[PDB]
């Protein structure tokens, strides 16, 4: 948890989130349900698609081994060929193993960052009209119906519209 979102203040994943990596859950008088964030998921798909494609192209021109025959009087020459092919394979094995380990750390941390950005995007948009419960959820001080929830999901919350109603409930 480099960014503290996955396994951090959001301690559990969602099994009902089936149409995207990341998204929202809401619950009001009308009902409740999940909704994947397609835009953030698509951007994540772009990095992983390019990250793997870049991996293939780099080791595209890896060293290739060719069999050779040497007589019993060419022990030194045969040893050179043996140590060259073994040495090159050891170098390329290290590079392939290291790249996978380094990218796995990068990929898991990249996925961690996107939730923190998504969590902060909603928080900075509902500045004062909600409570920050600290477990990844926000509690509204006003009535937020499906049209209001959908505005929060697509980044079009009308803070001045609910500014007056929220503060009356917040104060008392």
């Amino acid at each position, epitope marked *: 948890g480099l960014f503290g979102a996955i396994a951090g203040f959001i301690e559990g994943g969602w099994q009902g989130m089936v149409d*995207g990596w990341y998204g929202y859950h809401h619950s009001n008088d009308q009902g409740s349900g999940y909704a994947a964030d397609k835009e953030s998921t698509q951007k994540a798909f772009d990095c992983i698609t390019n990250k793997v494609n870049s991996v293939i192209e780099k080791m595209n021109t890896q060293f290739e081994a060719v069999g050779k025959e040497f007589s019993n009087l060419e022990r030194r020459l045969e040893n050179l060929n043996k140590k060259m092919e073994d040495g090159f394979l050891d170098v390329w094995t290290y590079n392939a193993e290291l790249l996978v380990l380094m990218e796995n750390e990068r990929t898991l941390d990249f996925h961690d960052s996107n939730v923190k950005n998504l969590y902060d995007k909603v928080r900075m948009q509902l500045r004062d009209n909600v409570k920050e419960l600290g477990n990844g959820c926000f509690e509204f001080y006003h009535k937020c119906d499906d049209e209001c929830m959908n505005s929060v999901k697509n980044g079009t919350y009308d803070y001045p519209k609910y500014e007056e109603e929220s503060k009356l409930n917040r104060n008392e």
Partner: antibody
Amino acid sequence: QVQLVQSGAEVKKPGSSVKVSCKTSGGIFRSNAISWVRQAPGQGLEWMGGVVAIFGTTNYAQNFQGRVTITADESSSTVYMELSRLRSEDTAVYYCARHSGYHITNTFFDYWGQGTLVTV
Amino acid sequence: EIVLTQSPGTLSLSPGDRATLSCRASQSVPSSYLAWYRHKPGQAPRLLIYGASSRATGIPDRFSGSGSGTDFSLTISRVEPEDFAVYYCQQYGSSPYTFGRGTKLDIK
């Protein structure tokens, strides 16, 4: 450089099923949603259904609900379509279309398959 | 379910004539999600225009289109010998993903 390869032409009889495949190249794993669009000769193109890239969620048109089953295997990056209970006027050319994104919604068909002709 | 009505139907032209194809929608297409495809018989359809205002990659400059609401159009300033096929318009802003009637272009 992305191409979609489908199965061959098939002949069937009413009451049987069809299994049309569509394998996509250009990457290790499929990252774009694939849908199925058919064109009956003398009629226009119709949308049958599609499958999301990684999560495998499937959406079907109300006309073909209960008769079409679209499945994909992540290992082989192939998409299969299974149309059951064949009847008259099910003769058409089936294309597999690749969406511009990972999801069916709000995405257009970047590329199309060459097409398979199925007769009942 | 948005039904798309393509008006011209048949449009016989010669290389050089301006080609204007009109696609009409029963209800407004959200976010102007409409695309145009070229489907020569015996070949897989190819994407010409997506979003009603953006050209697809590799498409020659002569292909362009514009529109909004329920009215969309495709314009080909200069017709070439390879511009004779059936042109469809789809809307991808609604769940059913309906398709257009299609218009074949003939040789005069």
